[PDB]
Amino acid sequence: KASQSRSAKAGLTFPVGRVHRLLRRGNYAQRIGSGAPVYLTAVLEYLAAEILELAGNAARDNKKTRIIPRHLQLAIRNDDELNKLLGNVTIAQGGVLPNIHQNLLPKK
Amino acid sequence: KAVVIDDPPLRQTPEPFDEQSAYNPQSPIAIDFGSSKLRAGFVNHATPTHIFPNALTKFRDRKLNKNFTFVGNDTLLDQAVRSQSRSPFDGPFVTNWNLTEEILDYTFHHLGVVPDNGIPNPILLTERLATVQSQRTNWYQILFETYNVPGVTFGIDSLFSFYNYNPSGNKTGLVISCGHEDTNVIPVVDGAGILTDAKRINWGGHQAVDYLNDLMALKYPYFPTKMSYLQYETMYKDYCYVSRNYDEDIEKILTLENLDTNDVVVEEKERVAKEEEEKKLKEQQWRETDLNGWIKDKRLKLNKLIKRRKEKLKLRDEMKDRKSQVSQNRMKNLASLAEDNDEDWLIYTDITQNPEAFEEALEYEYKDIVELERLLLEHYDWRNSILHLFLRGPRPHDSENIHEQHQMHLNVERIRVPEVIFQPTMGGQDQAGICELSETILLKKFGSQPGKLSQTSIDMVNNVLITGGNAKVPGLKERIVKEFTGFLPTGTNITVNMSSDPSLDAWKGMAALARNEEQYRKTVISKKEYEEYGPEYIKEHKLGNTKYFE
Amino acid sequence: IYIEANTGAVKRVGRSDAYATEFDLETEEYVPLPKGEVHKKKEIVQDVTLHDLDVANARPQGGQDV
Amino acid sequence: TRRHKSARQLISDENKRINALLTKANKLVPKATYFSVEAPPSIRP
Amino acid sequence: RKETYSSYIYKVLKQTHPDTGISQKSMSILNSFVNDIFERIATEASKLAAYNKKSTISAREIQTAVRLILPGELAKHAVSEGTRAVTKYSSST
Amino acid sequence: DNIQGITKPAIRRLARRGGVKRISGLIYEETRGVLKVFLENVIRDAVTYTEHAKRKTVTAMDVVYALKRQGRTLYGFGG
């Protein structure tokens, strides 16, 4: 009779039921369908997985084993759809990508 | 040469009336209430008197008369009155019933019938195999109270055609009926159809025309005009055939030697200037002296410029991929430039993104290639591209002319559309095909083992009949014969029958039943049986339906 | 398959082409149906020498498989 | 007076009438109904 | 008692990078990020359901909200992942 | 040639609305390239609203909501 959660029924590692809870008493709608938390959970799965991929490659690119917010900042700002989505948010302790204008160089 | 299609031409002459002097109050009337057409006539004739599509429409006029009697063949008069026609059939069943009364009144008016207290003639009627009880009770109610006929008979049109082609009434054979909305395989033993083993496939001519419409709209999403149902119907009729072997015809249909035949087409400065003039004069002298060597050098330069431009285009295409190793190398270079010299400053300057400068460099390289081509003159094909072969056939295509911008090609669809009755999975129906249903009827049923056929199975194989309106597609009989030889044991004789026109065999069937034999009276239901047994009464005769339970 | 009536030899040619879509990737090889009849008969003439019979009857280790 | 009674729901109430008759008769095999005539899925791939 | 997503996203990182450590502040940024994304998607879906005079939230309005919010190739990969997840979950038969 | 629908004196009319004495000749095609991305950016969020409404016509009701979603809420046509 005992069966496990809906997250592995959908094959996901994020909690489906917690997302369903937050959608229920988040007063967005008076009635919430069954398939909505699964879809939202899968979208959050792919977004978090892609952000962790870019952060892991950034941390490999600096020869470290830990995720610094510099790695998150360079991974977000280097890539362009993450630039468009996250243009208006300032990452805490992120810094600024190096850029020099061509006319400001010592051209000679 | 592209052939243009249009709407079918309209009937100029109106449909005629039967004479009043030919009225016999005791003669019956045979009515085939098909989904696509209606066939009505008196019993004593051999050919049905009235053929028209089973549709009607309402007409509105400015004079406020509301004349709405455009029924059947009357709709084949104007384009506006034809497009608003509506059939009583929604799917395989009849949903609305006032239009059925109007259609029956129209055909009773055109049959030369003068009634009194209802119609005084018995009625021959067909019905769908294993129909629902509500259709039967409502048919009983309308035919016994609205029109008050003395006698009513029910049956299946495939069984009626089988009785037509063996009027002894006790033969044994196999009936395959390809109708408008469904396909049935009905086994017959001793003249009585064994309805416990008949099978039905939910596919017909209507689904085939809709499948052709969906396929052809998927093939050309930017078609300028919109084509009606009748245009898809007539190019389904004229350009479709059943292949002898689909699994070999698919692998060679798009080759060049096959597409040419069976593809149808349906519609300081002065010193620099003096140096440039001297270089031009030297080039002219070299062209006048050694034209072949200068032509070879210019062709080699054009080839080198084309190779460099191809490498630049390959690099530009590879730079767009985010998951490519060049993008990972660019990310590593950005991380190294962040990690950190004139060389480093030059690398940081040259590591900048320049898409517009890449387009300008491509334009300059194209100009240099054009200059090399002009120097060679002075001194990507569609054969191997299967998408162009599927789209525009074996001829080159240009998009600037309006004649072939309204042009359609039918190459794969000619065998793809009639193949769904053999593989219903292509149409989305999870059912077995015609050949597998015939195999499991003849081989794993009726006291027959695989490898040992009984006498009933041999008599069934020797008397296979194909009927229905959808038997007009060529190549059906040969394919059925080939598959039947495929699964049967060796030495078995297979005989198939097919009419010259298999649409009208059901009308000849009930004409021969009501005329030639007096055993038509065995199946006749009267007033008293309806009144004492109720509408849920079924006569278990040899040509109609049976009781739902055991 | 392939069955010889007189000698009882059995040879497997491969799986039929009608079962080629049970899996996308498979180890079995797929061959079409034979276009001829199932039963075939033929008359052949065998030429042997006495030395071949002497060799075949005098194998020192023993017989061999096909 | 008759309802419009589209072709989808006719299958539904005929099926529910068949199931009601079957559950009355149990607490009797069918012979030839609209659902017994329908072809089974294929066995070959 | 307080709520965080930390073990789940930790597992997501161990699926692709096993030998990688974590700053707690990085969890603070990424928790704020996933909450902010859930925030915009959920009120876009509620706004769209209030537009269509419907009282129910299903998979199709959040599908349209994902198409509205995300850029096009992320939108198509996100709806691909969501559709395969919801069809896997819907096969409870 | 249908992309040549917008005409150069109309761009001049828009320019003199801004109050500019001198217009160079490249500004017309620059504004063409600017406007072409711009209206497509609201056609992006209009027809998806239309499709989610199970409608095959657009109206004044979804286009104002597309502009209100992006951030230039416009008065006059309801909403």
Side-chain angles (χ1 to χ4, degrees), chain A residues 1-50 52-75 77-108, chain B residues 1-65 67 69-267 273 293 335 338 355 357 361 380-550, chain C, chain D, chain E, chain F residues 1-13 15-67 69-79:
Chain A
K1 191 212 164 184
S3 45
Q4 57 94 20
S5 147
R6 338 186 218 163
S7 55
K9 299 263 187 316
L12 304 176
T13 88
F14 264 38
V16 163
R18 159 173 285 143
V19 153
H20 205 32
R21 197 248 318 272
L22 291 180
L23 259 194
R24 186 145 30 250
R25 64 181 80 111
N27 66 90
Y28 310 92
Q30 83 95 17
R31 173 175 266 103
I32 300 301
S34 267
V38 184
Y39 205 70
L40 190 39
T41 303
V43 167
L44 297 192
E45 210 66 0
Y46 174 99
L47 257 295
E50 201 57 5
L52 281 169
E53 217 36 45
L54 264 285
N57 274 357
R60 222 197 61 276
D61 247 14
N62 210 272
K63 339 307 154 282
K64 317 229 197 312
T65 65
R66 303 208 98 94
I67 306 293
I68 315 296
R70 161 66 54 162
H71 299 157
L72 301 171
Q73 177 76 288
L74 74 97
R77 294 291 161 300
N78 166 55
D79 173 357
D80 51 350
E81 61 284 9
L82 294 199
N83 265 313
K84 155 202 151 193
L85 272 169
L86 306 180
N88 81 305
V89 49
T90 88
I91 278 194
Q93 194 35 279
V96 158
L97 264 293
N99 70 345
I100 329 294
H101 195 198
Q102 303 345 320
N103 299 350
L104 261 306
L105 305 161
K107 180 243 182 171
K108 179 59 177 79
Chain B
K1 175 58 68 179
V3 53
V4 70
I5 66 167
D6 253 359
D7 288 25
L10 315 100
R11 204 182 306 274
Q12 300 319 105
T13 310
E15 79 301 329
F17 285 91
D18 287 309
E19 292 176 351
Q20 300 298 322
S21 51
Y23 193 19
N24 182 266
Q26 315 99 326
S27 180
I29 290 119
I31 292 182
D32 183 51
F33 209 76
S35 154
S36 158
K37 269 170 194 184
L38 203 145
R39 297 138 189 136
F42 267 123
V43 159
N44 71 94
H45 292 94
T47 293
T49 74
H50 283 286
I51 310 296
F52 43 85
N54 194 9
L56 88 161
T57 167
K58 327 286 267 197
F59 188 78
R60 176 55 59 198
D61 41 349
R62 35 87 167 172
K63 75 197 54 180
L64 199 43
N65 283 4
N67 43 299
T69 50
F70 286 81
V71 181
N73 214 311
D74 313 348
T75 78
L76 262 297
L77 263 301
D78 190 276
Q79 292 87 272
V81 69
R82 193 164 49 150
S83 317
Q84 312 195 65
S85 81
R86 157 162 63 251
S87 90
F89 272 94
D90 284 32
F93 300 133
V94 188
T95 43
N96 85 93
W97 289 94
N98 321 316
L99 303 174
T100 71
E101 301 205 2
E102 177 143 4
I103 281 162
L104 287 185
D105 280 359
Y106 162 77
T107 195
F108 275 151
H109 194 283
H110 265 264
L111 266 166
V113 167
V114 176
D116 38 357
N117 209 321
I119 302 304
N121 311 271
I123 280 290
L124 265 283
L125 195 45
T126 83
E127 69 169 4
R128 186 140 278 100
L129 152 71
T131 183
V132 293
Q133 170 73 288
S134 86
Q135 286 294 318
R136 176 192 313 280
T137 61
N138 190 25
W139 260 119
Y140 270 144
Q141 176 254 316
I142 180 182
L143 204 45
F144 264 123
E145 314 309 308
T146 323
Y147 289 145
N148 218 28
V149 288
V152 52
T153 47
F154 286 141
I156 322 184
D157 39 1
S158 43
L159 299 189
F160 273 128
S161 52
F162 188 74
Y163 182 78
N164 170 48
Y165 270 103
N166 49 89
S168 168
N170 55 341
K171 294 318 186 79
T172 296
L174 186 66
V175 189
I176 303 178
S177 162
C178 306
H180 193 73
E181 303 238 348
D182 60 330
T183 308
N184 318 317
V185 179
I186 299 177
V188 183
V189 167
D190 288 343
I194 309 298
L195 293 196
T196 85
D197 285 309
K199 296 298 182 194
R200 170 193 81 236
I201 304 174
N202 309 108
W203 195 264
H206 186 51
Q207 287 94 333
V209 173
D210 297 330
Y211 192 49
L212 176 61
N213 200 353
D214 291 2
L215 276 178
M216 272 326 307
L218 270 169
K219 205 173 147 153
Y220 297 90
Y222 308 129
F223 214 55
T225 169
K226 147 77 177 77
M227 271 177 328
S228 60
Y229 184 88
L230 303 176
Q231 299 171 268
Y232 283 95
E233 192 214 353
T234 178
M235 51 205 178
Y236 165 67
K237 273 187 205 343
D238 304 349
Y239 309 102
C240 270
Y241 68 102
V242 176
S243 71
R244 192 62 46 80
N245 201 352
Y246 195 70
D247 265 348
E248 322 187 53
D249 230 348
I250 274 297
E251 285 62 4
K252 64 190 74 178
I253 198 152
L254 283 197
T255 51
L256 258 288
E257 85 285 340
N258 204 296
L259 263 184
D260 36 22
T261 319
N262 57 89
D263 175 36
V264 300
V265 179
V266 183
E267 192 192 32
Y380 41 85
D381 61 321
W382 53 268
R383 309 304 210 284
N384 34 22
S385 80
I386 211 171
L387 186 49
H388 170 267
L389 283 174
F390 176 58
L391 254 292
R392 285 310 195 281
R395 295 307 156 82
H397 173 55
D398 58 313
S399 62
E400 68 267 4
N401 49 338
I402 210 75
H403 259 299
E404 82 182 42
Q405 215 180 349
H406 288 214
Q407 211 134 311
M408 304 192 23
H409 292 236
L410 321 179
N411 42 17
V412 200
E413 302 94 322
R414 318 226 296 148
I415 57 162
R416 196 185 167 172
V417 174
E419 209 67 29
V420 202
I421 61 179
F422 292 92
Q423 323 179 41
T425 316
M426 316 194 20
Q429 325 278 316
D430 212 27
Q431 284 158 337
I434 284 302
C435 300
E436 202 200 303
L437 285 173
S438 297
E439 192 262 324
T440 187
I441 279 177
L442 294 163
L443 280 180
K444 308 177 258 235
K445 216 162 292 294
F446 278 15
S448 289
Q449 301 324 290
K452 178 182 191 28
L453 279 189
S454 82
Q455 194 51 241
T456 317
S457 294
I458 293 159
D459 298 9
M460 256 179 180
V461 162
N462 209 266
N463 210 10
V464 176
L465 173 62
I466 302 161
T467 171
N470 213 37
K472 86 189 91 196
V473 168
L476 197 52
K477 171 202 167 161
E478 295 93 336
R479 169 88 182 249
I480 281 183
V481 152
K482 179 221 213 327
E483 298 265 12
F484 268 39
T485 326
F487 67 88
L488 277 177
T490 49
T492 323
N493 39 355
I494 305 141
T495 292
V496 283
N497 301 333
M498 164 93 101
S499 273
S500 52
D501 169 83
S503 323
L504 305 165
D505 40 11
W507 196 90
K508 310 173 161 51
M510 325 147 289
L513 182 59
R515 181 190 46 245
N516 170 237
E517 274 215 89
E518 212 44 59
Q519 305 321 295
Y520 153 70
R521 213 50 57 85
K522 189 189 305 299
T523 75
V524 160
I525 316 178
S526 42
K527 295 292 178 199
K528 262 75 54 182
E529 298 148 300
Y530 185 47
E531 277 133 9
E532 77 200 59
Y533 305 132
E536 41 268 15
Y537 172 57
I538 286 174
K539 276 194 73 106
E540 286 83 12
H541 62 285
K542 276 172 161 203
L543 277 196
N545 264 275
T546 37
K547 156 185 56 146
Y548 293 94
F549 285 92
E550 287 267 352
Chain C
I1 58 165
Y2 166 86
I3 290 181
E4 216 278 334
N6 293 93
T7 68
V10 169
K11 184 186 78 177
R12 165 179 186 277
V13 195
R15 208 134 160 83
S16 170
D17 268 328
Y19 297 91
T21 55
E22 52 193 355
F23 294 98
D24 307 8
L25 203 42
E26 211 32 73
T27 282
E28 265 101 9
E29 75 165 293
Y30 292 110
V31 284
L33 271 181
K35 305 303 237 322
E37 287 222 38
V38 191
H39 185 201
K40 292 169 140 308
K41 227 177 168 36
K42 194 158 100 158
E43 287 331 285
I44 47 166
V45 168
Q46 290 294 136
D47 295 359
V48 289
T49 55
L50 289 185
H51 176 239
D52 303 30
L53 311 180
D54 296 0
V55 161
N57 295 12
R59 294 178 307 257
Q61 317 281 337
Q64 72 272 35
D65 302 359
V66 200
Chain D
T1 50
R2 273 98 42 97
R3 279 152 96 149
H4 267 289
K5 271 318 233 184
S6 57
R8 166 193 31 89
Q9 65 208 120
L10 275 161
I11 317 287
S12 81
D13 41 4
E14 165 73 276
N15 177 40
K16 88 149 61 50
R17 145 169 181 275
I18 278 296
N19 298 319
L21 258 191
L22 266 161
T23 197
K24 167 40 54 178
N26 197 7
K27 302 308 287 174
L28 170 46
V29 82
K31 176 159 131 192
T33 53
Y34 198 78
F35 326 106
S36 157
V37 162
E38 183 136 4
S42 169
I43 37 162
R44 271 187 259 93
Chain E
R1 313 299 307 120
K2 64 212 171 313
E3 199 281 314
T4 166
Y5 292 61
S6 296
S7 41
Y8 314 119
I9 164 172
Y10 275 157
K11 284 202 251 183
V12 177
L13 179 53
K14 251 84 161 182
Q15 295 310 328
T16 165
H17 292 289
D19 42 354
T20 310
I22 283 284
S23 147
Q24 313 314 80
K25 294 322 310 163
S26 307
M27 227 50 41
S28 181
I29 319 163
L30 263 55
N31 235 1
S32 317
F33 160 73
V34 62
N35 287 300
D36 159 16
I37 288 304
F38 165 75
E39 161 46 70
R40 36 221 282 187
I41 288 180
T43 87
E44 191 46 10
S46 183
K47 158 69 199 82
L48 198 45
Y51 193 90
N52 261 15
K53 314 344 161 194
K54 238 177 154 188
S55 300
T56 316
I57 282 283
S58 74
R60 83 182 304 263
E61 319 78 338
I62 39 177
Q63 170 148 281
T64 322
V66 158
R67 294 201 141 120
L68 254 293
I69 288 304
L70 257 53
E73 85 313 358
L74 283 172
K76 99 191 261 196
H77 299 117
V79 300
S80 274
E81 211 66 40
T83 37
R84 64 151 311 300
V86 72
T87 39
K88 167 151 180 322
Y89 169 71
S90 195
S91 75
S92 70
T93 36
Chain F
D1 66 323
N2 200 19
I3 175 59
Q4 304 346 286
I6 273 299
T7 173
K8 276 176 45 55
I11 315 169
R12 203 163 286 104
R13 219 153 305 122
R16 302 294 215 261
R17 170 59 261 185
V20 194
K21 190 260 289 183
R22 205 140 193 276
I23 311 298
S24 40
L26 255 298
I27 309 319
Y28 305 90
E29 43 271 56
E30 289 154 32
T31 45
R32 276 211 150 181
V34 152
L35 163 44
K36 156 74 141 53
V37 152
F38 159 73
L39 82 173
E40 159 285 350
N41 246 11
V42 310
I43 293 332
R44 273 290 61 91
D45 304 8
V47 316
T48 67
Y49 265 13
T50 292
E51 167 294 344
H52 189 247
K54 293 134 180 194
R55 280 166 69 270
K56 58 156 54 61
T57 185
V58 311
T59 172
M61 192 30 35
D62 36 38
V63 62
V64 61
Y65 267 52
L67 295 174
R69 211 203 69 84
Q70 159 260 339
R72 322 150 170 157
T73 85
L74 161 45
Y75 300 162
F77 322 111

